[PDB]
Design a protein around this ligand. Structure first.
Ligand SMILES: COc1cccc2cn[nH]c12
Ligand SMILES: [Zn+2]
Ligand SMILES: [Zn+2]
Ligand SMILES: [Zn+2]
Ligand SMILES: [Zn+2]
Lengths: 131, 286
């Protein structure tokens, strides 16, 4: 009964992060000890002629990015744990997230390490036009 | 190649929208093409779902610097015999809005304590995962009859986990700097630990030099067994599965080979007492 959501390649990392006091720190540490990034994300096929904004309603990858389903790039959604956000709600689930191609092998790690500019809508250090 | 960990137990026939699915496997077939997924204009997100996600199938086989191994060897367990606490859980089954996973109902320990929880699960929604009461029933059959009255005697998990920490602290503070849960066929005990255990690097207590055995979500602080009043999580427990020591057949048959003073009263605490007793007879008697 039921429908699988996960693959065996992710069992170890997700179990470790599902039990951690600090899930983001646990994922960072797991990678530093040689672990593989979380796979089985929702990667989109698109025209790569989008706005390049970080978090969007539909896929918006430019030629330097890939588009992913937002819940699939969120460690808290992937582990089914509390979000550290104000009322425990996610800012990625229900949106698409654009990730620089140079970082697309680890979308979950990318979203944990980076921040979106509220003025221009692009990732700080990966598109932000405010500096 | 798929696992049962985080299986979606809802009865919804279709998968999720690409922006809401946690994984590629969980996206509905209608969005899959050319090895990836597509956004389809006019096909909306689902803004009212509640999908129960199974916690059966955790794998604690990571090797991460500075994080202790949860599962320990027989030799290490023997040195820490004073920290041994037998643990067993009787479950109930998800029903109605979900099917296909086991929820903790009666948590039993070798101290003789049984605690009863409200049937609670991890329900994915459009905004988060809601840790909430779910529809459940005891498994069918005369051997699960005693669980029927427990379906209406449960305490909420925020209360149960405080009681577990207090019981372990009272039992172990003058016996050990840790706990070793002594298990028999550990899968469901490990699923139940998700409800009351946290892990991380080895820490020291907030009020002394002893290692931390408890954590508080109220203050994000750590405590040993002596300073844990009010704390809600067990932190960095250890454990061992006695069934892996080569035994054949069920717990009771192996326990009865060495002991006659523990009659089977068919309850979680009794299985927990028999598991610790079998491990003690195997390692320390003759
Ligand atoms: C996935 O790796 C990380 C998560 C959160 C913070 C940091 C900092 N470096 N790497 C991190
Ligand atoms: Zn999320
Ligand atoms: Zn900016
Ligand atoms: Zn202390
Ligand atoms: Zn006995």
């Amino acid at each position: 009964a039921g429908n699988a959501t996960e693959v065996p390649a992710n069992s170890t990392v997700l179990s470790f992060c599902a039990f951690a006091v600090d899930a983001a720190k646990a994922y960072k540490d797991y990678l530093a000890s040689g672990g593989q990034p979380i796979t089985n994300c929702v990667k989109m096929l698109c025209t790569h002629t989008g706005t390049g904004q970080a978090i969007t309603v539909t896929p918006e990858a430019n030629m330097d990015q890939e588009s992913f389903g937002g819940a699939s790039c969120c460690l808290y959604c992937r582990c089914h744990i509390d979000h550290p956000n104000p009322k425990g709600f996610c800012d990625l689930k229900g949106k698409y997230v654009q990730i620089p191609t140079t970082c697309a092998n680890d979308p979950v790690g990318f979203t944990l390490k980076n921040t979106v500019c509220t003025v221009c809508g692009m990732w700080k250090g990966y598109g932000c036009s405010c500096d | 190649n798929v696992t049962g960990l985080f299986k979606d137990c809802s009865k919804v026939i279709t998968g999720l929208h690409p922006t809401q699915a946690p994984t590629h496997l969980s996206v509905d077939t209608k969005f899959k093409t050319e090895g990836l997924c597509v956004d389809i204009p006019g096909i909306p997100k689902d803004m009212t779902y509640r999908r129960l996600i199974s916690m059966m199938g955790f794998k604690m086989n990571y090797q991460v610097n500075g994080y202790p191994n949860m599962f320990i060897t027989r030799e290490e367990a023997i040195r820490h015999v004073r920290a041994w606490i037998g643990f067993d859980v009787e479950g109930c089954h998800a029903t109605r809005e979900a099917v296909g996973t086991n929820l903790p109902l009666q948590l039993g320990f070798s101290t003789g304590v049984n605690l009863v929880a409200v049937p609670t699960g991890y329900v994915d929604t459009p905004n988060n995962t809601d840790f909430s009461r779910v529809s459940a029933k005891p498994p069918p059959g005369d051997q699960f009859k005693h669980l029927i009255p427990l379906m209406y005697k449960g305490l909420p998990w925020n209360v149960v986990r405080i009681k577990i920490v207090q019981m372990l602290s009272d039992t172990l503070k003058n016996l050990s700097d840790r706990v070793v849960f002594v298990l028999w066929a550990h899968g469901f005990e490990l699923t139940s630990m998700k409800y009351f255990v946290k892990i991380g690097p080895e820490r020291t207590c907030c009020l002394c030099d002893r290692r931390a055995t408890c954590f508080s979500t109220a203050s994000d602080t750590y405590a040993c067994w002596h300073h844990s009043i009010g704390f809600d999580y067990v932190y960095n427990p250890f454990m061992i599965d006695v069934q892996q020591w080569g035994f054949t057949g069920n717990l009771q048959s192996n326990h009865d080979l060495y002991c006659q003073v523990h009659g089977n009263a068919h309850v979680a605490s009794c299985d927990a007492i028999m598991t610790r007793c079998l491990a003690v007879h195997e390692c320390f008697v003759k």
